[PDB]
């Protein structure tokens, strides 16, 4: 198996959501993960795995548990707090057989505290922490941004830091421990560049009025004269001169960039604009610039765009696409991702592992 | 210094929003991170650091700065591909004097392609990779979800799995080697999930109209008596029947939760419902059940929501809230982040470096 954590051992306990993408992103990196499932996926994330079934209520399924556990580097759970406990399999019962094992916990709400009991989702996660309030435009409600800042990118991303970094601790104390994470913690790190601009006028929590968020002219999508966006990240006043520059206005009879009183009359000026020629226009204009200027691609035209087509972000599976192994490594290189394959037998992964 | 990093050693080049916020995380889990800049910081991002200062077009700067990295286990840059080399730091130079570097290349295009060398923002790179496009209403134009997902979701915490990665595989092949964490792959993975759901029918293309993006009337912010918000995550069936109930809605008075043609009668009855109370009414109802509905607070209000108290999710800085080490350790825990303090001397560093 290709890839920096070549040798590395993962049991996954299967559960929803940001657990199964941390444990993906594992195996792309080249690591052996078993995921124990209730007695062919088509689910793509599914892939860089070897899918097993027991029942861990049974003392037969607890006992094959505790052994693939036993050989393993970490154990990945998203259940409730106090479900693997229940089970025979918590933190105390799997130390007595290897406590050299990384215990990963992917909750919402965390370990403790008095919503850790509580079902809940995405939304509510960054509900909770100001995250969900920042969203969207200020004559709307919050918008979701999907499930990509709780779920992933501020739970599996940080269960991923955590395992990887009690890895390195290991390697000097030769000893695991649990990590607790929480994607209400997770997703607060995340966002800590606003809890910093808070501090310094940077930031305010008034919706859509910000640098980052659909406030700021240079700073959001345009839509064009085809019903289709570009998207503006012009921000240093260089970028912004060849976004005007590209558009054919004259910078002398256009509000200043940061004259935030007349936003309004620039948003407008660049609305007309952008409205005046096609989405595809806009990426021949801007070509080899420093304009920010980029054409806003559903998924279906992703796959065409060339410096997709020149990396290889892609690879064709099933459907159709599914992103390749990030980051990449000079070195030791992941390989395309292997397909959920069928069923294994249990005690075969045991005498593969011995 | 606590946490699970202590003993890491990393330089990081003075940059903007990915690069330091992975250096950040790595400072807050312990290691020991200094940061060179050009010739005190009130950025709490730059907590959990040592500044230094070279000027690395200089004879003396290069020589420094090369005499750090010597030392160092981790590199952090992200300039345009070429900027290092050019100036002497590019990863064949460092092998030279240290070849168990883990050298971290963090960019939104990534090292090579046609648009490698073109500026950009974290709006950009989500625009060309149908991130963008999924996100907000379908009456409205993409807004941008912060810069939440290409410079910290699929940016930062990709440039941290790699290096943390990189530095496992070190462990037995004795060497260093580079990782190209480019925003526009690594978002991709992050959303690798709805690339999943795409080729099973379980995600469209079509804006505001899927489970996730608030096409789903239990899946969304409503606006309560008060012109604030809540969050509703209901989506397993018993989720969804308790939100009904705290709601005193009969569920057979409403159209059944998944007959998406009478979607926009469910959510106009959720709308009257939510409407009719205001949010911090909600927030009481539904405490504790597994309703899955939320305030939505912002973030002046979060310090004071019980969970986030409890778990000390933040802390106070400067006069405001920073968020604490994300995730957590059972054994070597991460401490309160340390203030960025004044500069420093870099013959001072090297010579603390034994």
New interface residues.
Partial sequence: MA??????RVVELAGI?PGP?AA??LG??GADVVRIDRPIS????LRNRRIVTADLKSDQGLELALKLIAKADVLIEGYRPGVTERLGLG?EECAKVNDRLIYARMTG???????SQ???????Y????????????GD??????????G????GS??????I??????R???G?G??????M???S?????????M???GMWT?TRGANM???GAPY?????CADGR?????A??PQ?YAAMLAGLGLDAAELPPQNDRARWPELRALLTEAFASHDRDHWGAVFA???????????????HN????I??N??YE????????????????ASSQPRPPAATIDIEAVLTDWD
């Fill in positions: 890839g920096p954590l070549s040798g590395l959501g993408h993906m992103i792309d990196l088509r689910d793509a994330m933190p709400w965390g370990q403790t505290g008095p919503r509580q079902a809940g989702h995405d939304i509510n960054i509900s909770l922490n100001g995250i969900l309030h920042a969203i969207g435009r709307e409600r919050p918008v979701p941004p999907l499930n990509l800042v779920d992933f990118g501020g991303m940080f269960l991923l830091v955590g990887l970094a009690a890895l390195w601790e390697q000097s104390s000893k421990q649990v990590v607790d994470a929480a209400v913690d997770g607060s790190v995340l966002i800590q560049m606003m809890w910093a808070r501090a310094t929590d980052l968020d659909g700073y959001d999508t345009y839509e966006y570009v998207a503006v990240g921000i240093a970028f080899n610039s420093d304009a920010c200027v980029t054409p806003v691609l559903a998924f279906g035209e992703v765009e060339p410096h997709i020149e990396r972000t892609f599976a099933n459907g159709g696409w599914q992103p390749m192994p990030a980051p990449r490594f000079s070195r030791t």
